[PDB]
């Protein structure tokens, strides 16, 4: 039957799902790892023992244990990111949307969710593969991985909690797609992995890590970048945070075996309750347990890997949203509130600059401030608010991604760069927040096509325009249709540095995206801080 | 007779001079000090022994010994600043233009020439008091002072070369005006001292120095400021430069008496030949022998004097030109030439930034560069050229003057601030140079009124407009006529920070003149350099 597939791990039985007055197939909650529970918590992932019989792969799986956002209880804008299924340490599953009929060798797209490495779910309504798989004839796959302390506790030199295991989770799901996607009609030599936020930093991490490169063909990174300041810590810092997690749960801290044993005795929610207490600074856009530069998953420092062409050479498609910082100021910066225009006093701007660059000494704090303050009108709370939005977007997302895209292009086989600056017309967050972090996802997955979600026709036009760029890129390494009538999304070159707009207005091409500020973040401020 | 005046130092006989189809009186080359020759070279000035008989005060006096510009031999644009009379160490004289008939108590204006403390002449055609004295009924006085090593060699703790003597020259001329200007129909309680460049820094120095404040009423500073980075050195630096002058002339350097004796044996031109060899850096807009912060003329550091209201509280009128730096790049920066548009390579911009901020470490050099580079179009030789013009104007003139005007206004009785941005229509320098340092002088002295110098009628209108602002300010402490029809030049307040334009277009009022860049120069870069 269509909904029955003989994989190398065993048979699985999916279900027929409707999608825009037609139907396709779905295989939800397929295991790719052994459940990482008990003594396996914090351990590298093991591959799922193959099973006899048939797996009832018709319902979504548990979500992995994480912190749940309750800043705005009941508010859909915040709830759509929380787990919509019960949480279990047994989260290692993946979901396949297959067109119907089952093709024989179409393009495969693997989705990697974000959420700062401390949260995420493959099962969110905004991650639904069906609209994309159906509209573009691709096989859509979404994996899951251990987040939080469960996926990134880092006592290096120990083999019980080596770090990076949530990436190894991702890797094993990618190994399972390479081995088995052919039985779902997927071409295992045409897998494009894409992600956003932490998931975009993951996608670019698999580009760097050698153990990962041969498991996928090309890559899409959305608002994420392996070298983001929040995406990785050093071994010393990862150890310190692991030890401090132990101290919050009154653990014996003498040996690494003593810490790890103590942490496995604890229930999940006990580590989540104190997870945020181990950050070294008062900060925004910093998360506790993140990938560690370990010498194994990452052979050396990320900057030397980027300078020395030490990474998978292929094509990449990547880009940013207009107002990336505003979501994070809402959560931790003083002055901002969901229900005001959040005009920002001179004094609260000062406070935001501290929380955005928590590693900076006073002289660096002054440098940031000078660079982002209109001094002809300093006490303007809209200019102070918008300025903060740019401080957090540039430092944390846009400028580390530009650095990545300038370093990668020097050695790669193609690069396509976008600037998504369309405020969705049905957005529940205040208008001061602009074009929000993670709000292009709904267009990439084609939710505008559900003309029951209140979307303007132009936005459906935009979602189809975008979904085609993505799929055509995953299929060929160029989002442009050969012999096509629309304007061509130009390649990004070190010489000309072009990129395009993604909005309902006719496509436009600019260059050197936010270079002015990105010179400051990528080259000046690091030099200043290194100087004492 | 009109041209005969009985001063406290003796009678003097002036001459009748024509000025715009009428006539007034002039007393040229009146001594106010003993000739500072032989053993008096480098010494504080002594007052002119009074004389029997009558002084033939009808011809201009010698100019003081200085370096003569020969970068452009024959070119009037450069020659109009060189000495037009033979040079003598006996330069201590002053010149009075008196209206006719001799008024009884009109306003007195004393002019203090500039030229980096290393050059200047009271006798230049652009300093002619007659057009101003006649048009505005004021008594115009111009002093002279020892420049170069002759006026500012600084072996502190010695009484033979204590430093600052060229300012004491100025002071004695001001004491002579206070004592004697009443016999020329001048009101000695209404003396406004004005100057440009070094002369504007002098005017503001007499505001700070206590030994000077009671000798003048109010003050005009043009493109000059006591706290300019070139206007003063520390005692240690002034000693080092004095010792290095000795080393260039093969002097015994053991004792201060030995150095000073050796330097007095030398002819003047021997010190001028090597004067530039003692600067500590490769620089532009730095001069060898300048005022020294000595504890006497200046009680303490200039910044503490400005912070602690330690200065003459009165009214001041001051301002800057649009393109102050371009004159100095022409002389020492690579890429610039009198006869090209001087488009500036990326590499030669780099070189200019070095020569403009010679005291800055590499990190400071990067800060300047970042702040003044359009990174969306970095290899634009017009933007690099104009950018350099602003680097040198802001650092050396505009931003130290804004600092002065922000500190002085906090404690003073009035402040008026101008931005002179009219390119004179008959200017012999290339158009890339813009509105050049020291090219408002010709409007302040009313040379546009000579409709035989090729000036547009609008410019005569501007010169009369400006000459009236100056004189009416000197007379009252407000450039505005009471009950007048033109727009009012607003006072400068710490709150609103207004200022006006000086050009042929109808007057306009802006605020916070070049604050963006001046925050960087006055508050950020000093913090950065102090930090290691
Ligand atoms: C003391 O440190 C704490 C820090 C934080 C940070 C929280 N959240 C966030 O930083 C982010 C902000 C941006 C919106 C994002 N969700 C939407 C989203 C998800 C995925 C992709 C795209 C968009 C939540 C947080 O919920 O709780 C915290 C609690 C803390 O202590 C108890
Ligand atoms: C190695 O250091 C040297 C440095 C210099 C600098 C010279 N000149 C100037 O810096 C200035 C630049 C601006 C134009 C001004 N004159 C017009 C002016 C005069 C008064 C008020 C306003 C305007 C001359 C110079 O002539 O010769 C130099 C020779 C050097 O070594 C032999
Ligand atoms: C964008 C880019 O660099 N394209 C290159 C293409 O020129 C080259 O022929 C191909 C070799 O397979 O690799 C890729
Ligand atoms: C601009 C300014 O501050 N003006 C003051 C004026 O208010 C004051 O009455 C006067 C006292 O003589 O001194 C000056
Ligand atoms: C699969 O599990 C769900 C959830 O309990 C159940 O409702 C469904 O009928 C099951 N289907 C099969 C074929 O086992
Ligand atoms: C003053 O000196 C000049 C220059 O030598 C001379 O030509 C002039 O006639 C003299 N006048 C008097 C009155 O001495």
Q: Take residue A160 and report the two structure tokens written for it.
A: 């019980």
Residue carrying the six token digits 């500590």: B280
Instruction: Tell me how far apart the alpha carbons of residues B87 and B269 are, in angstroms, rounded to a whole number.
Output: 10
Tokens encoding A483: 């012999």
Count the Cβ atoms, other than its own, within 10 Å of residue B245. 22
Q: What is the DSSP string of B238-301?
A: HHHHHHHHHHHTT---SSHHHHHHHHHHS-HHHHHHHGGGG-SSS-SS--SS--B--SSSSSS-
- Whether the bond between A85 and the residue before it is cis, its omega within 30 degrees of 0, is no
Task: Work out whether strand A218-222 and strand A186-196 pair parallel, antiparallel, or are unpaired.
Answer: parallel
Q: Do the chains contact at B528 and A376, CB–CB below 8 Å?
A: no
CB proximity list for A293: less than 8 A, separation 6 or greater: A232, A233, A234, A235, A300, A301, A302
- Cα of A492 to ligand 4 centre, how many Å? 63
Contact between residue B107 and residue B138 where contact means Cβ atoms under 8 Å apart = yes
Which residues of chain B make contact with A379, given a CB cutoff of 8 A?
Answer: none
Q: Are strands B15-19 and B22-31 parallel, antiparallel or unpaired?
A: antiparallel
Say if CB A103 and CB A144 are below 8 A apart: no
Tokens 């179009």, residue located: B377
Q: Residues with Cβ < 8 Å from B61, sequence gap 6 or more?
A: B28, B29, B85, B91, B93, B95, B122, B123, B144
Ligand 6 pocket residue status of B478, Cβ below 6 Å:
no
Residue with tokens 């010792």: B243
Q: What is the 3-state secondary structure (H, E, C) of A372-424?
A: HCCCCCCCCHHHHHHHHHHHHHHHHHHHHHHHHHHHHHCCCCCEEEEEECCCC
- Spatial contact of B322 and B437, defined as CB atoms under 8 Å apart: no
Give the active site residues of B: 197, 324, 437
Tell me the chain B residues in contact with residue A364 when contact means C-beta distances shorter than 8 Å: none
Which residues, at least 6 apart from A342, have a Cβ–Cβ distance to it below 8 Å? A329, A330, A335, A336, A385, A430, A432
Report the separation in Å between the CA atom of B437 and the middle of ligand 5, taken as the mean of its atom positions: 86
- SS3 sequence, A327-354? HHHHHHCCCCCCCCCCCCCHHHHHHHHH
- How does B78-94 read in b/e, with b if 16+ C-beta sit within 10 Å? beebbbebebebbbbbb
Selection from B374, B393, B392, B394 nearest residue B384 by Cα: B374
| CA–CA separation, A328 and A391 (whole Å) | 11
B340 lines ligand 4 (CB under 6 A): no
Experiment type: X-ray
Q: Which residue has the tokens 């030490």?
A: A310
H or E segment at B64?
Answer: strand B63-64
Q: Give A370's contacts in chain B (Cβ within 8 Å).
A: 519-520, 524
- Assign B320 to helix, strand or coil: strand
Instruction: Compute the distance between CA of residue B273 and CA of residue B295 in angstroms, rounded to an integer.
Output: 30
**List of E strands, A146-241:** 186-196, 218-222
- B515 at the A interface (CB within 8 A)? yes
Going from the Cα of A31 to the center of ligand 5, the distance in angstroms, rounded, reads 16
CA distances, B399 to each of A78, A361, B221, B223, B437 (Å): 49, 26, 14, 10, 15
Q: Which residue's C-alpha comes closest to atom 4 of ligand 3?
A: A413
Q: How far is the C-alpha of B228 from the C-alpha of B526, rounded, in Å?
A: 14
d(CA A213, CA A417): 21
Q: Write phi, then psi, for A187 (nearest 5 degrees).
A: -85, 105
DSSP B50: P
Find tokens 């009219």 and name the residue: B422
How far is Cα A143 from Cα A172, in angstroms, rounded to an integer? 10
Per-residue burial over A370-390, b = 16 or more CB atoms within 10 Å of its CB, e = otherwise:
bbbbeeeeeebbebbbbbbbb
Domains and CATH numbers, chain B: 1-532 (3.40.50.1820)
Please give the residue of chain A at the shortest CA–CA distance from B374: A516
Question: Burial level of A62, CB count in 10 A (0-12/13-18/19+)?
Answer: buried
A375 interface with B at CB cutoff 8 Å:
yes
- B77: Cβ below 6 Å to ligand 4? no
- Sign of the CA dihedral with B67 first, then B71, B74, and B78 last: negative
* DSSP structure string for B104-156: SSEEEEEEE--STTT---TT-GGG-HHHHHHHH--EEEEE----THHHH---T
Q: Do B375 and A515 touch (CB under 8 A)?
A: yes
d(CA A366, CA B198): 33
Closest-CA residue of A relative to B373 is: A516
Task: Kindly list the distances between the CA atom of residue B359 and the CA atoms of A354, A387, B283, B414, in Å, as whole numbers in the listed order.
Answer: 30, 32, 9, 34
Inter-chain CB proximity B516 and A367 less than 8 Å: no
Residue of chain A minimizing CA distance to B516:
A375
Return the number of other C-beta atoms located less than 10 Å from residue A531's C-beta: 16
Yes or no: say if B189 and B167 are a contact pair by the CB < 8 Å rule: no
Question: Residue B205 corresponds to which tokens in the numbers above?
Answer: 């120095």
**Residue B3 near ligand 6, beta carbon < 6 Å:** no
Quoted resolution (Å):
2.8
Residue B143 near residue B30, CB atoms below 8 Å: no
Can A468 be counted among the known catalytic residues? no
Residue of A nearest to B526 (CA): A363
> Which residues are paired to A108 by β-bridges?
A139, A191
Residue A376 is nearest to which of B375, B516, B531, comparing CB atoms? Answer: B516
Please choose, from the candidates B23, B18, B25, the residue with its C-alpha nearest in 3D space to the C-alpha of residue B3.
Answer: B25
Tokens of B3: 């041209």
| C-beta of A199 in contact with ligand 1 (< 6 A) | no
Q: Which chain A residues touch B519 with a CB distance below 8 Å? A: 370, 375
CB contact under 8 A, A367 and B524: yes
| Interface mutation target, options A361, A515, A517, chain B, most CBs of B under 10 Å | A515
Q: Whose CA is nearest to atom 12 of ligand 6?
A: B56
Q: Which of A78, A437, A443 to mutate to test the pocket of ligand 1 (most atoms within 8 A of CB)?
A: A437
d(CA A178, CA A168): 15
- Nearest chain A CA: its distance from B499 CA (Å): 14
Q: Which of A197, A232, A288, A326 is catalytic?
A: A197
Please tell me if the CB atom of residue B56 comes closer than 6 angstroms to any atom of ligand 6.
yes
Residue of chain A whose alpha carbon sits nearest to that of B514 = A376
Residues of A in contact with B511 (CB under 8 A): 376
Q: Do A527 and B375 touch (CB under 8 A)?
A: no
CA B419–ligand 2 middle distance (angstroms): 23
SS (H, E, C) B386-428: HHHHHHHHHHHHHHHHHHHHHHHHCCCCCEEEEEECCCCCCCC
Whose C-alpha lies nearest to ligand 1, atom 14?
Answer: A327
Sheet with A22-31: strands ordered across: A15-19, A22-31, A93-98, A139-143, A106-112, A186-196, A218-222, A316-321, A415-420, A498-502, A509-511
Q: How far is the CA of A214 from the centre of ligand 3 (A)?
A: 18
**Which residue among A375, A511, A512 places its CB closest to the CB of B516?**
A375
A365 touching B, CB under 8 A? Answer: no
- The catalytically annotated residue of A89, A275, A324, A440 is A324
Q: Report whether B216 contacts B174 (CB < 8 A).
A: yes
CA–CA dist A170, A291 (Å, integer) = 12
Supply the DSSP string of A217-277, one letter for each residue.
Answer: SEEEEES--TT-TTT-B-HHHHHHHHHHHHHHTT---SSHHHHHHHHHHS-HHHHHHHGGG
**Which positions ≥6 away from A100 have C-beta within 8 Å?**
A2, A16, A23, A24, A25
* Best CA proximity match to A123, nearest among A193, A194, A62, A32: A62
Is the CB of residue A250 less than 8 Å away from at least one CB of chain B? Answer: no
Residues 6+ apart with CB under 8 A from B532: A531, A532
Ligand that lies nearest to the alpha carbon of residue A416, given by its number in the listed order: 3
- Asked whether the beta carbons of residue A524 and residue B375 sit closer than 8 angstroms, the reply is no
Q: How far apart are the first and last CA of chain B?
A: 68
Q: What angle do CA A509, A515, A521 make, to 5 degrees?
A: 145
Would you give the end-to-end CA distance of chain A in angstroms?
68
d(CA A72, CA B401): 52
Q: Which residues, in sequence order, are CB contacts of B157 under 8 Å at separation 6+?
A: B256
């Amino acid at each position: 039957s269509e909904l029955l597939v003989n994989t190398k791990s065993g048979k699985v039985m999916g279900t027929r799902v409707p999608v825009l007055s037609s139907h396709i197939s779905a295989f939800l909650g397929i295991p790719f790892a052994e459940p990482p529970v008990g003594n396996m918590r914090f351990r590298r992932p093991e591959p799922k023992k193959p099973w006899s019989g048939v797996w009832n792969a018709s319902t979504y799986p548990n979500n992995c244990q994480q912190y749940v956002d309750e800043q705005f209880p009941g508010f859909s804008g915040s709830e759509m990111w929380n787990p919509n299924r019960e949480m279990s340490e047994d989260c290692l599953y993946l979901n396949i949307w297959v067109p119907s009929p089952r093709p024989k060798s179409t393009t495969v797209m693997v989705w990697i969710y974000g959420g700062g490495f401390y949260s995420g779910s493959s099962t969110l309504d905004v991650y639904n593969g069906k609209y994309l798989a159906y509209t573009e004839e691709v096989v859509l796959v979404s994996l899951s991985y251990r987040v939080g302390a469960f996926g990134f506790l880092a006592l290096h030199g120990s083999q019980e909690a080596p770090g990076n295991v949530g990436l190894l989770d991702q890797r094993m799901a990618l190994q399972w797609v390479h081995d088995n996607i052919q039985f779902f009609g997927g071409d295992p030599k045409t897998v494009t992995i894409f992600g956003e936020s932490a998931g975009g930093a993951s996608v670019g991490m698999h580009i760097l890590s050698p153990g990962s490169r041969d498991l996928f063909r090309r890559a899409i990174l959305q608002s994420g970048s392996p070298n983001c300041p929040w995406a990785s810590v050093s071994v010393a810092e990862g150890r310190r945070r692991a030890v401090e997690l132990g101290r919050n749960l009154n653990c014996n801290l003498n040996s690494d075996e003593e810490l790890i044993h103590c942490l496995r005795e604890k229930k999940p929610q006990e580590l989540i309750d104190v997870e945020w207490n181990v950050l070294p600074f008062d900060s925004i856009f910093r998360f506790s347990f993140v990938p560690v530069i370990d010498g194994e998953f990452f052979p050396t420092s990320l900057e030397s890997m980027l300078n020395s062409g030490n990474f998978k050479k292929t094509q990449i498609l990547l880009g940013v949203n207009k107002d990336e910082g505003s979501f994070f100021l809402l959560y931790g910066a003083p002055g901002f509130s969901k229900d005001s225009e959040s005009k920002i006093s001179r004094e609260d701007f000062m406070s935001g600059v501290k929380l955005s660059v928590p590693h900076a000494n006073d002289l660096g704090l002054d440098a940031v401030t000078l660079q982002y303050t209109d001094w002809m009108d300093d006490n303007n709370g809209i200019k102070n608010r918008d300025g903060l939005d740019d401080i957090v977007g540039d430092h944390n997302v846009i400028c580390p991604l530009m650095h990545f895209v300038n370093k990668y292009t020097k050695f790669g086989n193609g690069t396509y760069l976008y600037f998504f600056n369309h405020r969705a017309s049905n957005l529940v967050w205040p208008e001061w927040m602009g074009v929000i972090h993670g709000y292009e996802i709904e267009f990439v997955f084609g939710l505008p096509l559900v003309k029951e979600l209140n979307y303007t026709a132009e936005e459906e036009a935009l979602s189809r325009r975008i979904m085609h760029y993505w799929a055509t890129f995953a299929k060929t390494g160029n989002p442009n249709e050969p012999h096509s009538q629309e304007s061509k999304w130009p390649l990004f070159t070190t010489k000309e540095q072009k990129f395009i707009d993604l909005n309902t207005e006719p496509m436009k091409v600019h260059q050197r995206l936010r270079v002015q500020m990105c010179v400051f973040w990528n080259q000046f401020l690091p030099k200043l801080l290194n100087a004492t």
